[PDB]
Design a protein around this ligand. Structure first.
Ligand SMILES: C[C@@H](CO)N(C)c1ncccc1F
Length: 119
């Protein structure tokens, strides 16, 4: 029932994500010189360094907010992909499955701790 535990759990999960080779295209903001039309398709860029920095600055109030930004990394890749078979998109799908598998207990534990706090 620790209402704060999610933060360190998210730091450790982001550490695992940065160790994954599949996260390399998503570690830093998309380079506009490599993908000149990126902002014509994507309204809200997001990357894992921005997520980590937001967490470390104390600018997420809950793991749901972090989860919304990580999911935006994956939806941006899906929206930008020219093909559902593209290399970078395929890496995003594996990384998304890994993230979802690990974030589920973080969200469950936080929501349960918060319900206990408000009992
Ligand atoms: C990091 C993502 C964009 O959000 N990246 C550039 C791409 N995403 C999917 C397919 C091809 C790509 F090049």
């Amino acid at each position: 029932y620790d209402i704060q535990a999610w933060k360190k759990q998210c730091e450790e999960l982001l550490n695992l994500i940065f160790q994954c080779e599949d996260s390399e295209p998503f570690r830093q903001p998309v380079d506009l010189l490599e993908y000149p039309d990126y902002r014509d398709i994507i309204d809200t860029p997001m990357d894992f360094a921005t997520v980590r920095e937001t967490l470390e600055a104390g600018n997420y109030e809950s793991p749901m907010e972090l989860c919304k930004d990580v999911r935006l990394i994956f939806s941006n890749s899906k929206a930008y992909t020219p093909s559902k078979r593209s290399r970078i998109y395929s890496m995003s799908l594996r990384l998304s499955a890994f993230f979802e598998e690990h974030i589920s207990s973080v969200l469950s534990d936080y929501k349960s701790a918060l319900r206990f706090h408000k009992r």
